[PDB]
Structures are given as C-alpha cells and as structure tokens.
Amino acid sequence: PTFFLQVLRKKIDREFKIQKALFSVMEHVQGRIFRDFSIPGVSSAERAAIYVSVAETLAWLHSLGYCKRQVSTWTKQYQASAHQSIPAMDQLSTWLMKNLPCLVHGDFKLDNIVFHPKECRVIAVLDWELSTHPLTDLAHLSLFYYWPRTLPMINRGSHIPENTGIPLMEELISIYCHRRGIDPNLPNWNFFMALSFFKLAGISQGVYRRYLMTANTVQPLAETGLQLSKRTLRTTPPSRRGQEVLTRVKQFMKQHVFPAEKEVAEYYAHPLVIEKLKEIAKAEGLWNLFLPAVSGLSQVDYALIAEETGKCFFAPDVFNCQAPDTGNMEVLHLYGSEQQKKQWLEPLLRGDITSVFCMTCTIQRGYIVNGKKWWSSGAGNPKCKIAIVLGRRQHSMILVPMDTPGVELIRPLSVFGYMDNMHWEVHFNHVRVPASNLRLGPGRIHHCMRTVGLAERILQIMCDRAVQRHEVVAHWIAKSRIAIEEIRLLTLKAAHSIDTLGSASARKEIAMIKVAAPKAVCKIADWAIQVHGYPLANMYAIIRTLREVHLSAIAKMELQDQARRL
Amino acid sequence: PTFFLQVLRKKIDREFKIQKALFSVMEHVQGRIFRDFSIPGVSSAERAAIYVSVAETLAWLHSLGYCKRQVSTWTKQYQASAHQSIPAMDQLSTWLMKNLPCLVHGDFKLDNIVFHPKECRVIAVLDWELSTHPLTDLAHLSLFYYWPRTLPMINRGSHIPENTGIPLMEELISIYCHRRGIDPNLPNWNFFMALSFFKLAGISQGVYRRYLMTANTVQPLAETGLQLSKRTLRTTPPSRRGQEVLTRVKQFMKQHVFPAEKEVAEYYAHPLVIEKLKEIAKAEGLWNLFLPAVSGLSQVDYALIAEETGKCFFAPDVFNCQAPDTGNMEVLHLYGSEQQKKQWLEPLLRGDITSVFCMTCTIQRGYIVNGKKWWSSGAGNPKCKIAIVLGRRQHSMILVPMDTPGVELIRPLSVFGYMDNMHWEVHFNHVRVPASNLRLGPGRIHHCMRTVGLAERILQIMCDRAVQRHEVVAHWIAKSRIAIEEIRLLTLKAAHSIDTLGSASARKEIAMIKVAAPKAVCKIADWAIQVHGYPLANMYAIIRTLREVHLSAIAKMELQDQARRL
Ligand SMILES: Cc1cc2nc3c(=O)[nH]c(=O)nc-3n(C[C@H](O)[C@H](O)[C@H](O)COP(=O)(O)OP(=O)(O)OC[C@H]3O[C@@H](n4cnc5c(N)ncnc54)[C@H](O)[C@@H]3O)c2cc1C
Ligand SMILES: Cc1cc2nc3c(=O)[nH]c(=O)nc-3n(C[C@H](O)[C@H](O)[C@H](O)COP(=O)(O)OP(=O)(O)OC[C@H]3O[C@@H](n4cnc5c(N)ncnc54)[C@H](O)[C@@H]3O)c2cc1C
C-alpha cells in the first residue's frame, strides 16, 4: 500500500526502514516539485538559493567498495533488458570496466524534492527506491549540465541556462565539498561521469521496455558518455562551454592540422589526409560545429571559434563548416519540411553529399526552373548532389537535385588563374521537379571572422619575415594591427547584437562588416607581399577572391535612424 | 543583567516580552555574524542564498499611522543631541516634514543576525531595542546600497559589489514583496529613503555624542538623503549605477545646457550662464564625475558618460571635468602627500582654483626650477593658481604655485587664428619653492571619448543638412558611420581592459586609440565642411587643434608580443 490517496503507508520494506530511521506511513506533503530543472518560475537569487539548499541537504544527508559490483549489476541488467542493437552501449561498458575507484538516494534529482509552499527550503525527499560510494550520487545529480544538445531534455524541461542565476558545475561542486570537508579536487571524475551516464541510459532503456509491455535516447546518452570519458574534467573551481570548446579546438588544431599544411599544399600543386582528419575530428566530437543546434553554443562563441579556425586555408573542411553547405543546412533545419529534411539533411549532417547555393532565372509554375547559373561555388565536387536556387514577390527558393535531367555543368571559372580545387558554371534547361522539392546574419558573421583570422596569420608571417631579414615596415605593422583589432571588434559587436536583441535588428552592423573588412584585409595582404619582395600566395588569392551598394544601403538606414530619432 | 557571559537573562522589559512572545533568558548562539555587508568569505551562490534567507526571515517575522510621530520624535532627539552646526540636517528635516504616508526590529541589518555554523540559514535575530509601518524597516535594511561613495562604510566593511552574487535592490524588493503578497510597486519611496537616512544620521550622531562623554558622517548622510529626496526610485523591478547616472546626465543635458548653446556662442564672439549651470549641476549631484573616487563608477560607465558629454563644446566645464584639471586632481588624490592634498585639492574639488600640466626644463636641487614652458593649456585663466611641471631618471614632478616669484606669462599662442577663450606661454626664471611642493590611461580614454561624441554630433549635423538641401554624399555618410562605430568600439575595449586586467596591461590599446581616432575624425570634419559648401566651425577648430611616434611604439610592442608568443 503505497499509491496516492486523498500518500499511503508505503523492496518497500527497505524504504520504510530508511524513512523510520530518518524520522529518528508518511502523509501528504504540501510543497512544490520543479519538473523542469531550469527553474523558470522564480528570480535569479531564488534559483541560487534553491540550488544552495539542495546542495546542503545532500551534504547533511550524506555526511551524517562495491561500486564496481554496482556497475557490473547495472551492466548485466542493461544487457539483459536490451531490445535493440547498441554497439555504443557495449563500447561504453568496456571502457568503464577499465576504470576503478554510503547511504545514497540512488536517483537524487531536482524532481524528487518537495520544497516549502512559500519558502525555498527542502521539506522532504522521496523516491528512495534504489538505495545501497559517497561521490556517485553527486555525479548523478550534476550530470544534467552535460545533457546532449541534440537529445531533448527529460521531464519536459529546458536545458540549464548560463548567466541566469543557476550555479555552475564547479561552483556547486565547491559548495558541496566545503559543506562536507573534502578537498575541492576530486579523483576519477571521468569514471564518475561515465558511470552516471551509463546508469541513466540503463534506466531509460528499462523504462522504455516496461512501457512497451526513452527508446531512442540510449544512443545519444552512450555517445556523450564515450565523448566525455576521454577528457580532463576539473572538479575544483577554475560562456564556459564556449571557452571549453575553443580550448579543445585550439589543442586539436595545433596537434594535428598544422603539420599537415605542407603535405596538403604539396598535394595541391581531397587527399586522404583530409579524410583521416575528418574522421578524427568526428570521433573527438569536434564536428558540425557551425550548426546552431547540433552544438548549442551562442553566436559570440561561434565567432571566436570561427576566428580560431580561419587561419588554416582548408581548416573549415575538417570541421564540416564549408561556405556553401552551412547556409543550405541552416535553411533546411530552421524552416524546412519534415519529409524534405529527412530526405536531404541526413545526407548532409553525415557528410554524405555536398550542396550549392546559386542565384547568379525562371521558376515559373509541378514547377519548371529553366535558366543559366553563374559563379556557383562548389558546383564541381563529385559529391555535390543537392542544389538550392532562389530564382524568379518572385522570391521562391526550391531545391533542385543535380542528377535531374537538364542540369549540366558548362565550364570552370578561374579567378586570377587559380582553379580553386578546394566555380564551374551551371546550366538548367527546363528541369522537371515535383512541388515537394520547393538568414544571412550567421553567414556574414562567419565569413568576416574567417577573414579576420586569415589577416591575423598574414600579419604574423609578415612580422616574422621582417624580423628574420626600417621605420616604414614598423608603420605598416602598426597600421595592420590597428585595422585587425577594429575589424574584430566590429564583427563581435554585430554577432552579439544578433544574439541578444533578435536577428531583425542587426542589418546595419551586418552591412557595416560587409563593407569594412575586405578593404583593410586586402591592404594588409598587399603590404605583406610588398615586404616579402610561401603560404602567403594562397592567402592573397583567397583575400582577392573574397573581394559598392552596401554603402548606399548603410546611408539609407542611417538617414532613416536620424529621421526617427528627431 | 544582559551583558556577555561565559548571553544573559536580559527598556529591557519590552525586549524580554518580545523574546518570550516569539518563543511562543536567551543563551549563547553558536553562529556567524557578517560584520562586513559585502560577505566576502563565501561564493556567489552562497551570498545569494544568504540574502534570500534574510529577506524571507524578514517577511516571516513581519507578515505573521504613527510614522510621522516617530519622525518627529527622531527629529527632536537629533536636534537636542546635536553638538555642531548642520544646516543640511535642518534642510533634510524640513523636506521630510512635507512628506506623509507593525512589529518591526528597528535596526534590522545584516550585522544583527546569527546564521547556522555550517549552513546559510537564519538561527536567531538580536538587538531588538528600538521596536515599536510595515515598510520603514525594509528601507532601513536596503539603504546600504546607496551608501555614499565618499563616506567610508560602517562596521569596517567594503561597499556592496555589483555582478558578484549579491541581489540588486529591485531584485531584493521583489523577493520580499512576493514573499509578503503586496504589489511590486511601492508608494512614497523617496520618503522612505529620506526617513531611513535621517534616522541613520541621528543614530550616528547619538553614538558619537555618547562616546564623547561617526562625528563627521552626519553631513555626508544628510547630503545624500537630500540628493535622493528628489528623484524617481522605482521600487518594482526594471553597471546599474552607471546607467542611472548616464540617464540623469542625458536628462540634465537636454533640459538645461543645449538651449544655452546659442547664448554661449554669441557671447564668445566665462559667462554667468556657465556659473549658474555649474551651481545647478553641483546642487543636482552631477559634479566632479570624472574623479574615480568621488563618483565611484567603473571605467566603462565613465567612457559612456564622457561620450554623452563630449557633444557640447563647453559641456565638460559644467561637470568640472576639464582637460588639464583632472590629471592634476588624479595625481594629487592617488599618490599625494596628505599635507599637499589638504593644501591643494581642497581648492580644486570645490572649483576654487584651476590647474595646468606643462612639460613642453631644469628641476635641479630646497630645489630650483628655471626653464621655459610652451603650449601650456589653460595657463591664462584668472583662477589658475597651481601648476604641475614634470621636468629634469630625471622624471621628478613638483608642484609650483604661479604666484611665486619668477613666473610670468609671456605671450598667447593662437591655433588657426582662434584664441580659444574657453595657450599662453609660461616662463619660469629661477623660482624658489620648498621641498614640500615636490597615470595617462584615463586621460587618453576620456580624450578619445569626447572626440567620438564630437564626431557623432558632426555626423548628425551633416546628415540633417544633406537632407534639408546624390550618391557621393550617401557614401560619405556611410563611411563616417563606419569609422565612428569602429573608434567607439576600440575606445570601449581599451577602457574595459584598463578596468578589468589592471592598468599596466593596456598600453597597446591606449597607443592604438591615440593613433586611430584623430585621423578619421578629421576626415569626417573635412567631409562635413565640404558638404556644407554654424556650430560646425567650432567643431572643426577643436578637431584640428586636437590633431607619428605612436606607430613606432605599437610596432615595437607588437614585435615583442610576437616574439613572446613563439
Ligand atoms: C570568388 C567568388 C565567389 C563567388 N561565389 C558565388 C556563389 O557561391 N554564388 C553566387 O551566386 N555568386 C557567387 N559569386 C558571384 C557574385 O555574386 C558576384 O561577385 C556579384 O554578385 C556581382 O555580380 P554581377 O556581375 O552581377 O555584378 P555587376 O552588377 O555586373 O557589377 C556591378 C558593380 O558596379 C558597382 N555598383 C553597383 N551598383 C552601383 C551603384 N548604384 N553605384 C555605383 N557603383 C555601383 C559594384 O562594384 C558592383 O559590383 C562569386 C564571385 C566571386 C568573385
Ligand atoms: C591644441 C594644442 C594643445 C596643446 N596642449 C598642450 C598642453 O596642455 N601641454 C603641453 O605640454 N603641450 C601641449 N601642446 C604641445 C604638444 O606637446 C605638441 O603638439 C607636441 O608635444 C609636439 O611638440 P614639439 O614641437 O616638441 O614636436 P616636434 O618634435 O618639434 O615635432 C616632430 C614631429 O615629427 C614627427 N616625428 C617625430 N618623431 C618621428 C620619427 N621618429 N619619424 C618620423 N616622424 C617623426 C611627428 O609628427 C612629430 O610631431 C599642445 C599642442 C596643441 C596643438
């Protein structure tokens, strides 16, 4: 007898004994239960007080080596209760079995605590079912910070916000430790995260199996557990997610991709080296970053990462953030048909096929699209299947597969005598496509950040050459640094304006960064090649290829703003 | 019997009755007592939890019209116990007497609460002496946010930090109100602040008088109470101090100083209008802003305010933030002899005398300073007495009063034929001065922010003239806007770098803003005067007067940074 009543008397014997001991037949508790773990119904100070209170009640209930046995039992239960193939689960179990290390609550979450009706203090704790290590429960509580950005959150809640009032993981860890007495640093933390994620995956699989007599969430959980199983999680105190991702990006870059620059350049005059690097980056978790949902970071962190990966010429290819593909990916994901999404994006997010965005025709109503394209970047790749054309309120963009009859590449276009193997013309002669086959802010931001990174590398090279081999060169260096700093500041300001105050109130800054950057970057490239009297050739080629209506647009917007202000 | 024991049994009868009723002879309480109200011994979440807990214990002890009589009694007690002349106290009492509107604790502060030894929860509340309105106690608790930036904090603590973890005043107000049930908005809040400040001043005066049988703190408290007695304090929820100061600056500007522009310009070809405006600004509290201790704001708020007050040509004169005076004031305040400070700064902070910083000689050891100055700005003012000269590690700056024998102005220097009534040469022929009479970051930041504001006003004027009367003018407008945005971003970045990561790690950005701004601002002025084919004459004069070694310095620093990075 433990069901609801209008609680009950309530291995129920173990739970009853635990309740009796704690008191040294529980009735109803008149308190709240935050289903969503983001706590959106209170202020910031209230959220911080709530999390401090749960930390201290955990400490008070804890402070007042069969862990491997528990891991083995959970592995056996998950393997016996499994109903679908899951190599990730077996890999995670094998990896955790290679790692070794009281009265816990088993499933201590924010959803199993009833507070006071008018005050933020813990009144009672329930659901003490799987109770039998003084640090595993803390890891189970704190794992929700690393809930995968792709998997929807459990208990119908939003992902944990940052800079809102919630304590960061290190902050909560320090609170609990100082409440207990142990040192802030903790050992075998990767093992704790792996065990917690594996236990959660097993619980979800068991719940799904019981409901059959949650199902698709075991694979993302196992993948994330494997991803965090090989890292250095600093328990002691030290967006934060953006900084961690940027640090990992820099480490991966400096450890793998810079030494391959010479080999790639020699092969230029896609190699299997790029394929191996792509596989390594996908395995390490650094893949499809630029997608604003598969990675979860904010716009400013995106711009900083793009700046960090614009230095190498072919760097965006490794992270699957090429120039044409990302716009089509964003268009498909944001406002796209579910059937069209399943048909097309699945061949993009896995890197199966490329894409192309072309507007440099007739889209008259099925519908027929007869016209001639031009300057279509990335149209010559052997793995280029999809194609998005926004041709003639005549703006109607419709997908057109390149394998459809009537599509035929005409000739390759050369810029300054470089074929750009890493601009073939396209002709569409009355292609028949079904009706099923039928913004710029992030694109401009990333296209400016990459150019800024390129200019920074150019300045580094020019400074090194000037030192290795007068006042004029020093003046050139100083002017280049000034221009680089100003352009970076403008780009970051535009990105932050897009992030905070919507996306429709940042057209002015986008036009401004579209105007400012290329001129100064071309000037810097010219000064560098003049000082030289080498990778700089590729940088100059890119800067010249990437090189006055936007000034008129900015003037119109400025005049409108001045008229509005008065 | 209420003294300490190793508490006691403990109008003590009223306190004993209150304790007995609350329980329905208190012993010692084993808990902490935060003397400093900033709570520096805990983390951010712990601070937020502490303040939430004090808010809810206040609400629980309160929720579970003799206010004018109490005000009159406090006024009588303060007047009878007064020992020194205080017109501010009488003025505040008269102002409060014109404003009209349970079981309180009288002196409910963070210093009269004992928490738990290991948890952040309220255990007991003490010092219930003056207990007899359900909102006055809240105002007394929350007044500590407006502790004057000049008066040192009480109970030997630091001023309340921002963006640290402490709740903002509106946030705490909302917490307490939602705990009680009243609406977030509150009436007669200015009266509450005035009464709270007057009561605190009376308590301090009484404590000082009792100790004589705190003394100098009654005047700043009364002045601050008078200053906040005339404002609009929004109780409901809506740096914050920087934003409030900037809003007040903009309101004062647009309400008083812009209409006087025509009169001042006509008088040009200091008037009593400037004196009246200076008196009004000093009365309103907007005075000596640029001093980094008499105002208390951070560097970024300082730059934003300076940008807002750089638009009017003579605006810095009203706020007492002139170009030469502020450097000498900062040098005196930061590292200056107490005797020298009392001798000189007191004639500056009150606007009694001006100053001048001149280095464009011999300071050989008393000491004699014989040499010829040049381009000494502000040396012709009739109220110019002090003078700081850093002349010949020969850098030894020594104050030299201008009334001393041997100092005589030579001739006035004209720039472009403007005498600049709002540059006389100085000659020092063996001045005898005692040995008693013996950085650039804020100066450069403000000197760039004012120029940015001037450029913004110039662009506004040029846009208005272009509308009132082609593609080239539109292109000019767009380029001017781009340059203005880039320069503002650079200036703010340099100011923030000075603020956060010390003042010795921002020389590069300071040199960068010293290089970048004048060229673009001069170009904008040239384009404006070309479009015109008027206040713009004064703006061009200033921009030209304010107009290549810094490039070499920046190149040297950049080369050193590149060498260090490798
Ligand atoms: C490296 C590279 C990659 C490219 N990739 C792509 C791609 O992926 N997809 C794609 O669709 N296109 C692509 N393009 C083409 C790109 O769209 C063109 O550079 C651009 O659209 C101009 O094409 P256009 O010949 O129509 O310009 P035109 O209209 O022929 O050029 C007119 C020029 O005159 C000037 N001008 C315009 N209006 C005014 C005015 N009112 N007053 C004064 N001057 C004015 C401007 O300088 C303007 O560029 C690429 C080009 C390059 C060089
Ligand atoms: C409006 C105004 C207000 C002023 N107010 C003050 C004031 O309050 N206090 C004060 O002390 N002074 C003041 N001055 C003077 C100011 O210090 C001077 O403008 C400046 O110091 C230059 O003086 P100078 O004659 O010694 O320069 P000079 O040394 O005679 O000029 C040399 C010039 O050559 C160039 N140059 C220098 N080194 C190099 C190099 N290595 N390579 C190439 N070119 C180089 C630079 O353009 C430099 O300005 C003011 C000036 C003006 C115009």
Numbering used by the authors:
A (entry chain C), B (entry chain A): 54 to 59, 66 to 69, 81 to 94, 118 to 157, 172 to 208, 215 to 245, 248 to 328, 339 to 363, ...
Quote the original article.
Here we reveal that two atypical acyl-CoA dehydrogenases, ACAD10 and ACAD11, drive 4-HA catabolism in mice. Unlike other ACADs, ACAD10 and ACAD11 feature kinase domains that phosphorylate the 4-hydroxy position as a requisite step in converting 4-hydroxyacyl-CoAs into conventional 2-enoyl-CoAs. These features allow them to phosphorylate and process 4-hydroxylated acyl-CoA substrates, ultimately removing the hydroxy group and producing 2-enoyl-CoAs that can enter the FAO cycle.
To further explore the bifunctionality of ACAD10/11 at the molecular level, we initiated cryo-electron microscopy (cryo-EM) experiments with the ACAD11 K* and A* mutant proteins purified from Escherichia coli. To assess whether substrate interactions affect protein structure, these mutants were incubated with 4-HV-CoA and 4-PV-CoA, respectively, before preparation. a, Cryo-EM map and model of the ACAD11 A* mutant tetramer incubated with 4-PV-CoA. To explore how the kinase domain might bind an acyl-CoA substrate, we modeled 4-hydroxyoctanoyl-CoA (4-HO-CoA) in the ACAD11 A* kinase domain’s active site pocket. We observed that a substantial portion of the CoA moiety associated with residues inside a cavity adjacent to the active site opening.
